[PDB]
């Protein structure tokens, strides 16, 4: 299925995923796509911050949901 990701910048890249994909997997889908280390990504859905461990369905995300991307960076 498909969902979107809106970086703060306003940029909106869009991902193919599975309802039972871990967040870890998204973060991974982004690294191999924007080369941003998962361990620097943090992801938010409807104001909730999501956990490396739980799946999309856990958070009730569905086709064409927008997640916003924010970075943690304590390396610069
Ligand atoms: Zn998957
Ligand atoms: Zn990859
Ligand atoms: Zn939003």
Swiss-Prot record:
Known outcome of mutating residue 65 to G: Phosphomimetic mutant that can recruit PRKN to mitochondria
Residue numbers of Phosphoserine PTMs: 65
Effect of residue 72 to G: No effect on ADP-ribosylation
Record note on what altering residue 72 to K does: No effect on ADP-ribosylation
Impact reported for residue 74 to G: No effect on ADP-ribosylation
Function: Exists either covalently attached to another protein, or free (unanchored). When covalently bound, it is conjugated to target proteins via an isopeptide bond either as a monomer (monoubiquitin), a polymer linked via different Lys residues of the ubiquitin (polyubiquitin chains) or a linear polymer linked via the initiator Met of the ubiquitin (linear polyubiquitin chains).
Name of this protein: Ubiquitin
Organism: Homo sapiens
């Amino acid at each position: 299925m498909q969902i979107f990701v809106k970086t703060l910048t306003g940029k909106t890249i869009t991902l193919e995923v599975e309802p039972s994909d871990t967040i870890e997997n998204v973060k991974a889908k982004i690294q191999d796509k924007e080369g941003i280390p998962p361990d620097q990504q943090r992801l938010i859905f409807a104001g909730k911050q999501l956990e490396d461990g739980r799946t999309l369905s856990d958070y009730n995300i569905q086709k064409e949901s927008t997640l916003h991307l924010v970075l943690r960076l304590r390396g610069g």
